[PDB]
């Protein structure tokens, strides 16, 4: 690992500098280096890991969608043949995206998840596992697409089971997990009714628990509740 000679604390420090500089590829490399030191991650370090890779894969996913759309127009009737270049470049971006997803899933499997015993860390990492299998599913077209989708589902489901048992309904990790699993149902699993049911139950149960919260916790939870409501408004 290219980060093997750098101190864990220095990697975390530079991850935070990279975030401020909007150097998210650097941020992700620094956080990968920190994970590979072998120690568990704190709450703030987990969020650095998530923010870094989400920004990296977000650029790739946006690019893949643009290129996929161009590729599909070219396969319409009446479209002029322009050669293999669009497919080739879409495939190049797709392969790079899949490599980033494989890297994150590898970090979770070696060995973040197996050492995560607290609800907050285990649910966080299982949500991440569901998310990055979901991004693999967005580009999957072959024989293992069903298995990729079921890997995402299985990770989300175990995270949901733990979060329901161990976290209050307003917990921001529980809420973001439910938001993402709901989107999984809507656009990956072809299950829009499940997506809507999950978003609405999650919103309603969080609403009924807001009265227990401080002002700052209330702001954190209601922000995510609004994202759930926005999705419901889009879907109904």
């Amino acid at each position: 690992g290219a980060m093997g000679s750098m101190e864990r604390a220095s990697l975390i420090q530079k991850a935070k500098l990279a975030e401020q500089a909007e150097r998210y590829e650097d941020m992700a490399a620094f956080m990968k280096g920190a994970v590979e030191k072998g120690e568990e991650l704190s709450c703030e370090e987990r969020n650095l890991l998530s923010v870094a890779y989400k920004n990296v894969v977000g650029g790739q996913r946006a690019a893949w969608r643009v290129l996929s759309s161009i590729e599909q127009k070219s396969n319409e009737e009446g479209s002029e043949e322009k050669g293999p270049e669009v497919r080739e470049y879409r495939e190049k971006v797709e392969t790079e995206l899949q490599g980033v997803c494989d890297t994150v899933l590898g970090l979770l499997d070696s060995h973040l998840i197996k050492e995560a015993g607290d609800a907050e860390s285990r649910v966080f990492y299982l949500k991440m596992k569901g998310d990055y299998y979901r991004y693999l599913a967005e580009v999957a077209t072959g024989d293992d697409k069903k298995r990729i989708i079921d890997s995402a589902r299985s990770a989300y489901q175990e995270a949901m089971d733990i979060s329901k048992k161990e976290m209050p309904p307003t917990n921001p990790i529980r809420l973001g997990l439910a938001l993402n699993f709901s989107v999984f149902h809507y656009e990956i699993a072809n299950s829009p009714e499940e997506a809507i049911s999950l978003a609405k139950t999650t919103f309603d149960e969080a609403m009924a628990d807001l009265h227990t919260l401080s002002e700052d916790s209330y702001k954190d939870s209601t922000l995510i509740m609004q994202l759930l409501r926005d999705n419901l408004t889009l879907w109904t």
Binding site: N55, D131, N180, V183, Y186, N231, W235
Partner: peptide, 10 residues
């Protein structure tokens, strides 16, 4: 206007 997942990009 895309549906929301978390975290969001910068």
């Amino acid at each position: 206007p895309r549906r929301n997942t978390l975290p969001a990009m910068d």
